[PDB]
Amino acid sequence: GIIEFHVIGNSLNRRVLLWLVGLQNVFSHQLPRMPKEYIARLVFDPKHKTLALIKDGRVIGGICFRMFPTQGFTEIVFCAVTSNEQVKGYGTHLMNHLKEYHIKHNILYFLTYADEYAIGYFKKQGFSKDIKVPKSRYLGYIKDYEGATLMECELNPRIPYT
Amino acid sequence: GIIEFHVIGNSLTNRRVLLWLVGLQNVFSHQLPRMPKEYIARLVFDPKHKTLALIKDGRVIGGICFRMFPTQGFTEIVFCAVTSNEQVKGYGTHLMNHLKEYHIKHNILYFLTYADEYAIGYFKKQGFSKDIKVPKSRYLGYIKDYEGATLMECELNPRIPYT
Amino acid sequence: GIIEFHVIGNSLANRRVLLWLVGLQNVFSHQLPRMPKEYIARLVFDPKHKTLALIKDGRVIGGICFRMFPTQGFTEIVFCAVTSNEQVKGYGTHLMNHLKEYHIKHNILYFLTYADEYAIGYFKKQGFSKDIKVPKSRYLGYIKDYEGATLMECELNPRIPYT
Amino acid sequence: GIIEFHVIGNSLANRRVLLWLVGLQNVFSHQLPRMPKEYIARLVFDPKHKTLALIKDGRVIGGICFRMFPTQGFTEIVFCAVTSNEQVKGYGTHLMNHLKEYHIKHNILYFLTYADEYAIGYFKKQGFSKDIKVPKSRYLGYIKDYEGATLMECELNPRIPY
Amino acid sequence: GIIEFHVIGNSLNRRVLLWLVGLQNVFSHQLPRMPKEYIARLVFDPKHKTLALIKDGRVIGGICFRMFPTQGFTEIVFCAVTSNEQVKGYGTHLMNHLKEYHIKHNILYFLTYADEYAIGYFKKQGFSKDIKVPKSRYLGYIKDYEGATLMECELNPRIPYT
Amino acid sequence: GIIEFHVIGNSLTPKANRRVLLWLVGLQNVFSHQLPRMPKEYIARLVFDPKHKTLALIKDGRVIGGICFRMFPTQGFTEIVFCAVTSNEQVKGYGTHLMNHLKEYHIKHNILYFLTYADEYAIGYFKKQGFSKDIKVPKSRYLGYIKDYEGATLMECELNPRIPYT
Amino acid sequence: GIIEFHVIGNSLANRRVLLWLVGLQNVFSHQLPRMPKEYIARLVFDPKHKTLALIKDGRVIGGICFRMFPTQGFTEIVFCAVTSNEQVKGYGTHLMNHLKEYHIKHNILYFLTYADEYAIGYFKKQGFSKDIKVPKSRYLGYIKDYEGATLMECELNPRIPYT
Amino acid sequence: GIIEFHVIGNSLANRRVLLWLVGLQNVFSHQLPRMPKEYIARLVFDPKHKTLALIKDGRVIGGICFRMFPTQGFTEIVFCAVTSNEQVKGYGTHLMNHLKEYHIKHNILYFLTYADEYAIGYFKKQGFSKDIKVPKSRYLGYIKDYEGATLMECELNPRIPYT
Numbered sequence A, E: 001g002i003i004e005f006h007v008i009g010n011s012l013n014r015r016v017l018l019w020l021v022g023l024q025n026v027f028s029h030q031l032p033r034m035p036k037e038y039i040a041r042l043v044f045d046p047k048h049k050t051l052a053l054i055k056d057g058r059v060i061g062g063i064c065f066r067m068f069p070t071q072g073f074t075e076i077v078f079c080a081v082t083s084n085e086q087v088k089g090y091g092t093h094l095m096n097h098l099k100e101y102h103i104k105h106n107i108l109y110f111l112t113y114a115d116e117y118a119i120g121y122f123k124k125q126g127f128s129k130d131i132k133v134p135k136s137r138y139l140g141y142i143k144d145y146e147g148a149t150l151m152e153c154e155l156n157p158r159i160p161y162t
Numbered sequence B: 001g002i003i004e005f006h007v008i009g010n011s012l013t014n015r016r017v018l019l020w021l022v023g024l025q026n027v028f029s030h031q032l033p034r035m036p037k038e039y040i041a042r043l044v045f046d047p048k049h050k051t052l053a054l055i056k057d058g059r060v061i062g063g064i065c066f067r068m069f070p071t072q073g074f075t076e077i078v079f080c081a082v083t084s085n086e087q088v089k090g091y092g093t094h095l096m097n098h099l100k101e102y103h104i105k106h107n108i109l110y111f112l113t114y115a116d117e118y119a120i121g122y123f124k125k126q127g128f129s130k131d132i133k134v135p136k137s138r139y140l141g142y143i144k145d146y147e148g149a150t151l152m153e154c155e156l157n158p159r160i161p162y163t
Numbered sequence C, G, H: 001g002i003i004e005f006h007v008i009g010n011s012l013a014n015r016r017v018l019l020w021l022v023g024l025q026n027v028f029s030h031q032l033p034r035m036p037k038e039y040i041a042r043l044v045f046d047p048k049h050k051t052l053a054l055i056k057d058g059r060v061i062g063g064i065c066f067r068m069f070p071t072q073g074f075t076e077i078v079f080c081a082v083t084s085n086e087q088v089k090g091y092g093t094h095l096m097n098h099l100k101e102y103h104i105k106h107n108i109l110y111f112l113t114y115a116d117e118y119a120i121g122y123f124k125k126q127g128f129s130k131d132i133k134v135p136k137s138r139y140l141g142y143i144k145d146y147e148g149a150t151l152m153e154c155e156l157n158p159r160i161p162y163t
Numbered sequence D: 001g002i003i004e005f006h007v008i009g010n011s012l013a014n015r016r017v018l019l020w021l022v023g024l025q026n027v028f029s030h031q032l033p034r035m036p037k038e039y040i041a042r043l044v045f046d047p048k049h050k051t052l053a054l055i056k057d058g059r060v061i062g063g064i065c066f067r068m069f070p071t072q073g074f075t076e077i078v079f080c081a082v083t084s085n086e087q088v089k090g091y092g093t094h095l096m097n098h099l100k101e102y103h104i105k106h107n108i109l110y111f112l113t114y115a116d117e118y119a120i121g122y123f124k125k126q127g128f129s130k131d132i133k134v135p136k137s138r139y140l141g142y143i144k145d146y147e148g149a150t151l152m153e154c155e156l157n158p159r160i161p162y
Numbered sequence F: 001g002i003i004e005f006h007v008i009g010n011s012l013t014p015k016a017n018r019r020v021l022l023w024l025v026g027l028q029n030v031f032s033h034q035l036p037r038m039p040k041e042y043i044a045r046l047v048f049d050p051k052h053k054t055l056a057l058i059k060d061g062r063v064i065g066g067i068c069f070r071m072f073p074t075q076g077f078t079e080i081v082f083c084a085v086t087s088n089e090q091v092k093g094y095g096t097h098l099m100n101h102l103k104e105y106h107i108k109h110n111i112l113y114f115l116t117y118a119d120e121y122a123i124g125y126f127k128k129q130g131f132s133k134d135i136k137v138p139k140s141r142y143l144g145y146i147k148d149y150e151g152a153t154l155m156e157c158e159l160n161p162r163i164p165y166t
């Protein structure tokens, strides 16, 4: 069906706001350990944005992120594809658009914390455990999950990702 | 008594508020005898300072005055006090827990403060540690230094309800 | 005689202020003979630069020229001078103490300046130190670097009165 | 014909500046044929990028595209080119010299650039070294990283104007 | 690949800005004998419009044209498809949308100058060397080119072109 | 029955009211039916073009005919675009009354020339309305302004402004 | 008798100008009885038309109705009349000179007119020729070719003082 | 000295321009004596006209008075003069060159003029020709065909820089 990618957020529109509830639902459901209250407060925060994957008008997931352009990196907050649509390449297409978007916006480092269950998806998206950004650049901006691995992805502004 | 919490401050944009701030400055000044009253009033009434108030029957009986540094990613704890005949009751801990809840909702997860030897044990029980994860390059020159006091730090878990 | 202090500047000037700046530019130039006159003019009349003028009987006799960097949490001292025949009467010190008082009230508590062989002993007596506590990462792209002079720092105690 | 120097940039209504930025983008993309044209064009027209432009008789013959990082105490040097038919005329040296002049007025005393094998000789001659005195924690994540090329620094001498 | 057509221009918007730069590049590169500045002056001239061919976000061709409603014709100014995309039909489709646009705006005559390497393309778009529009109507409005061949195309507003 | 002539059109500055708009649809229907080799999408585009106008023949409220035209007052002539009388009203002289009302309208607007293209099934009507195959307006004046039709005869009509046409 | 020349017309209004435009309509009609006075009134009152009026001692005694086609670079002479009791006094010629002068000052240098047989001598004397320099494509269908009427042209010299 | 080029013209307005226009009227008038001064002044101060003024140290030493007919696709060259003691230094050629650059910017790529016998060699060195590409229907009447003058044409190339 018609697949479409939109970067959306709760600015400073009905279809957008309902897409955001759709996203908040998909993060909660694929990310059980994340409290629903705190997924919601982040998804609906202005300083956060989300790349929404829309299959035929209906949200089937996306990537919630927080650009820190004073720092040169972007945090990756939530990632989920709905369970009946996983292992269809949908998550890689999501990351790649996310890369393209950040290319155009001169930001070329991703940082994220990964669980042991999900680390292999980030490895397969180019992420690495070798964190070249100085600790002093991110501590107190990215939400430390202690007991999860910090990972990093460097974007090349000269490859087309999409 | 009826207990209220309220975050307040001299916005550079109310009367119940104005006297609440006067009660805080009085409370802070009386519980912190080595803080110049003039200095206390200058910070409580500064606009980039906010103050969590604790109110028992309309009457200001404690609070945490604090300074949000959202660009630097932390908050400074300016004053803490519970008035004398309301101490040792758990009020201080309900203030700190509230103040934590606020700061999660505003996506700040670090408290920096300075502690003399008589307040270190208090902050320790609010979960403050001497080990400072925040880089000096980020707080020095923004937080009021206190040579002679232990700097302390608190990291918040936004997965968690404090109140 | 009748002395007064005023923190004047050039935003977007009175006749009274315009000539005061010109007076301040003259005093700065005369007491700093190897500073190009125009460079002094371009900073005294700069909008982001302010000046604490020292007036005696209506006439400019001294001043300190400074640039506040509240986003970086320090102020840059630019020019300091007392006219020839008013020196060594303490005018120098009260000019600093007034600037320290002004800066407590704006919660900037760090001065940074460069001092050549002809002024470091002045700055030593105003509490300046060669030990720079401010991060190099915080001022390098901001303050003019007078290579060949000694970078020096003053930290302010916002709890004591300076005047 | 008369020679001009002008530091221009994208901002927020001048036909002249606009066709000079296209002139620049063209000369950059011609002398850097292994860069994406879209990358050069997205940077030249970026408003946190500036470009020193070198004019001979109304049309662009050269320029230096750069990115000032005052809160880091240096400037990233992004693109350097003089057109073919005007090279080996000391033209690229006056560009680097006006750029130093401009930057000493603005209290930036460090240049950071990457240089491959075709360019490293020229930057050595304008005074750049491989000895990077800027801490890795001041520049990493701010300057466009180029694995494979060599990071070069140039340190400027401060000056009291007039 | 997601194909798009957009009739754009420089009214007196960044996406559109970078697109005109894309267009000015493609023109300049498929038309080496055209001054790069000259192409730039006409593409960024407000009374000029370019029909862009956008393939998966990037420009891969267009037609720059000049509508002369007073005179009752339009001037074809530049046509190019990027090298690796030629002989795929893109050119013919570009003309076909451009004929479609002009039907909807009551302009039913195209005029252009073509060198020998381009006569066949315009012949295949319905262009003829027989110029029905009077010389008084076009001379000193369309830029003439000593040497090239004046070519005319007449549109049927009762036909659908796309 | 009751007969009215109205010069109407898709005025793009005042809202064409419902009465006008339903007449613009009716004329589009009539032209389409009487001119079937003309695409109906073409007819609608032109009838509703703000630079076009239409003299509507209105009988007891319903549209029974019209002459849609385009005035080129810079060029000094007018194009005749569509002519139709509905079938059950033809050969009653309605065709001619429309043309004459149209001539009388144009001499008041100081345009004294009609140009049109006619195929063999229509050349006779326009001849009876005064058109000639002999075109005094120069080619440079009309070409690429009026919709050419190859295989139609271009036909011209010159109007005398000292004459009262209706 | 006091003689005035006024270029008037029915623009986008004045009592005096209105009664004059009627006075002109009369004179033209009466002097040109074989043109429908209906048609004369239309043109005289058309706003793209103008009439230079010959006012003698208050009353309208003649004039020239003309239509400027600036985009074409010519003016059409439409009606010319002096009332009867005032003919052969040179009034026709003074009207034509004031008209020439008027057009010089508007950068229009060509007059076209279709003339009946009873008029050719008057236009000849005013410098009109039957030899027509303007191209047919510039004037056809802007001025009305009347059958049996003679097109005449007058070309004007910007450097000549006509009045 | 300081040379400037200013396209000026009456606007249907500023003392510096007005005195420049009067200066231009004198320069033209003085170099072209057998042409009515009142005609030169009418044209210079007409608003459909513009003049490319050549200023050398405050004062008018020449210019090109021209007339853009953008409906018709060309500009009319009307008066070229350089004050007598500044001639044969190239001033009139920098004048035409500037005028060509101006017109390329407005998509007017043809200049028509009626040269007198003393002017022809100048127009020839500016690229003019007696072979007129522009159809007579496009210029006739719009410009004045002075008996004895030679119609000359210049086609501008918009891909070349002229200044």
Ligand SMILES: CCCC(=O)SCCNC(=O)CCNC(=O)[C@H](O)C(C)(C)COP(=O)(O)OP(=O)(O)OC[C@H]1O[C@@H](n2cnc3c(N)ncnc32)[C@H](O)[C@@H]1OP(=O)(O)O
Pocket: A030, A031, A076, A077, A078, A079, A080, A081, A082, A085, A086, A087, A088, A089, A090, A091, A092, A093, A112, A113, A114, A115, A117, A118, A119, A120, A121, A122, A124, A145, A148
């Ligand atoms: C602490 C918070 C940090 C965050 O931002 S959330 C951490 C990641 N989130 C989750 O795992 C939530 C639930 N999982 C999901 O929603 C999706 O499976 C997920 C991770 C978004 C991937 O989307 P999909 O469409 O399933 O992936 P895909 O079709 O594009 O295939 C990508 C390749 O990666 C591989 N992979 C490794 N670990 C995986 C894993 N844990 N889940 C899914 N795939 C994983 C998988 O083999 C897949 O195919 P291939 O091997 O490349 O051919």
Ligand SMILES: CCCC(=O)SCCNC(=O)CCNC(=O)[C@H](O)C(C)(C)COP(=O)(O)OP(=O)(O)OC[C@H]1O[C@@H](n2cnc3c(N)ncnc32)[C@H](O)[C@@H]1OP(=O)(O)O
Pocket: B031, B032, B077, B078, B079, B080, B081, B082, B083, B086, B087, B088, B089, B090, B091, B092, B093, B094, B113, B114, B115, B116, B118, B119, B120, B121, B122, B125, B146, B149
């Ligand atoms: C440079 C200084 C700037 C600043 O940040 S202000 C520093 C703090 N200021 C002051 O303490 C001035 C006055 N202090 C007070 O009024 C109170 O002691 C204080 C610290 C406000 C706490 O208010 P309370 O309502 O009494 O707190 P609470 O009932 O929740 O009990 C806290 C538990 O911690 C324990 N504790 C250890 N050392 C303490 C200490 N020095 N002060 C208070 N409590 C202390 C105490 O036993 C109490 O109960 P528990 O052991 O947790 O069961």
Ligand SMILES: CCCC(=O)SCCNC(=O)CCNC(=O)[C@H](O)C(C)(C)COP(=O)(O)OP(=O)(O)OC[C@H]1O[C@@H](n2cnc3c(N)ncnc32)[C@H](O)[C@@H]1OP(=O)(O)O
Pocket: C031, C032, C077, C078, C079, C080, C081, C082, C083, C086, C087, C088, C089, C090, C091, C092, C093, C094, C114, C115, C116, C118, C119, C120, C121, C122, C125, C146, C149
């Ligand atoms: C590169 C940036 C350029 C600058 O702004 S740094 C240069 C500072 N300005 C100058 O050197 C301009 C000429 N000098 C002056 O105007 C004055 O001497 C100066 C330093 C501004 C202070 O004016 P005064 O009225 O003399 O200050 P004061 O009465 O409070 O003197 C108190 C104590 O200062 C002491 N001192 C040491 N070195 C000094 C020195 N180089 N200049 C002046 N005083 C100096 C002096 O001995 C006196 O001692 P004490 O306080 O009585 O124990």
Ligand SMILES: CCCC(=O)SCCNC(=O)CCNC(=O)[C@H](O)C(C)(C)COP(=O)(O)OP(=O)(O)OC[C@H]1O[C@@H](n2cnc3c(N)ncnc32)[C@H](O)[C@@H]1OP(=O)(O)O
Pocket: D031, D032, D077, D078, D079, D080, D081, D082, D083, D086, D087, D088, D089, D090, D091, D092, D093, D094, D113, D114, D115, D116, D118, D119, D120, D121, D122, D125
């Ligand atoms: C990616 C981050 C930014 C970059 O690194 S962009 C890479 C540099 N760009 C390019 O190389 C593009 C193509 N080349 C050019 O545009 C110009 O040649 C270039 C490199 C800008 C130099 O400008 P020019 O005006 O041609 O040079 P110039 O006349 O001032 O001569 C300076 C002296 O340097 C010397 N040199 C050594 N290697 C060179 C080299 N690879 N390219 C040019 N000159 C080089 C050259 O011998 C000349 O000698 P001298 O000092 O005048 O005696």
Ligand SMILES: CCCC(=O)SCCNC(=O)CCNC(=O)[C@H](O)C(C)(C)COP(=O)(O)OP(=O)(O)OC[C@H]1O[C@@H](n2cnc3c(N)ncnc32)[C@H](O)[C@@H]1OP(=O)(O)O
Pocket: E030, E031, E076, E077, E078, E079, E080, E081, E082, E085, E086, E087, E088, E089, E090, E091, E092, E093, E112, E113, E114, E115, E117, E118, E120, E121, E124, E145, E148
């Ligand atoms: C003086 C300025 C005046 C102007 O308007 S610019 C004149 C055009 N300039 C240029 O063509 C220079 C570069 N050429 C190109 O960009 C493209 O080839 C061009 C001409 C735009 C056509 O785009 P394409 O995508 O290649 O065309 P297409 O696939 O639709 O092929 C249509 C048929 O045209 C035919 N044709 C004849 N000459 C051609 C020629 N020189 N280039 C391309 N095609 C040409 C060609 O055989 C092609 O295939 P077929 O005939 O259907 O079998």
Ligand SMILES: CCCC(=O)SCCNC(=O)CCNC(=O)[C@H](O)C(C)(C)COP(=O)(O)OP(=O)(O)OC[C@H]1O[C@@H](n2cnc3c(N)ncnc32)[C@H](O)[C@@H]1OP(=O)(O)O
Pocket: F034, F035, F080, F081, F082, F083, F084, F085, F086, F089, F090, F091, F092, F093, F094, F095, F096, F097, F116, F117, F118, F119, F121, F122, F123, F124, F125, F128, F149, F152
């Ligand atoms: C390419 C687009 C050009 C255009 O403008 S559209 C061409 C005109 N429309 C059509 O051909 C299609 C449909 N026809 C009609 O609606 C009507 O018949 C038409 C042509 C509008 C005339 O309307 P009516 O009211 O019937 O005419 P009427 O009563 O005033 O006069 C009838 C007399 O005309 C005569 N006539 C000769 N050729 C004709 C011809 N080709 N079409 C119609 N009538 C024609 C017919 O013999 C009759 O004689 P009479 O004048 O009464 O003595």
Ligand SMILES: CCCC(=O)SCCNC(=O)CCNC(=O)[C@H](O)C(C)(C)COP(=O)(O)OP(=O)(O)OC[C@H]1O[C@@H](n2cnc3c(N)ncnc32)[C@H](O)[C@@H]1OP(=O)(O)O
Pocket: G031, G032, G077, G078, G079, G080, G081, G082, G083, G086, G087, G088, G089, G090, G091, G092, G093, G094, G113, G114, G115, G116, G117, G118, G119, G120, G121, G122, G125
């Ligand atoms: C623009 C077209 C308007 C039309 O419809 S035709 C315009 C002419 N209208 C008329 O003749 C109708 C009434 N006539 C008049 O009002 C006057 O005759 C007319 C033509 C306005 C001239 O007015 P006046 O005051 O009598 O003229 P004027 O004193 O300046 O004498 C000029 C010389 O014209 C001469 N002329 C030759 N043919 C003429 C002709 N057939 N009609 C009138 N005059 C004619 C007449 O002999 C007189 O003296 P001269 O012997 O040429 O030196």
Ligand SMILES: CCCC(=O)SCCNC(=O)CCNC(=O)[C@H](O)C(C)(C)COP(=O)(O)OP(=O)(O)OC[C@H]1O[C@@H](n2cnc3c(N)ncnc32)[C@H](O)[C@@H]1OP(=O)(O)O
Pocket: H031, H032, H077, H078, H079, H080, H081, H082, H083, H086, H087, H088, H089, H090, H091, H092, H093, H094, H113, H114, H115, H116, H118, H119, H120, H121, H122, H125
């Ligand atoms: C049709 C427009 C209205 C007219 O009638 S324009 C009548 C032109 N003449 C005048 O206005 C009065 C007399 N002359 C002048 O004002 C000036 O000579 C004039 C024509 C404006 C030219 O400007 P200048 O600064 O004097 O001369 P220039 O140094 O720029 O160009 C001179 C080169 O052209 C050549 N030339 C041939 N006939 C000429 C001629 N009759 N006048 C001037 N130059 C002529 C001559 O070889 C000279 O050589 P070179 O390029 O200086 O090395």
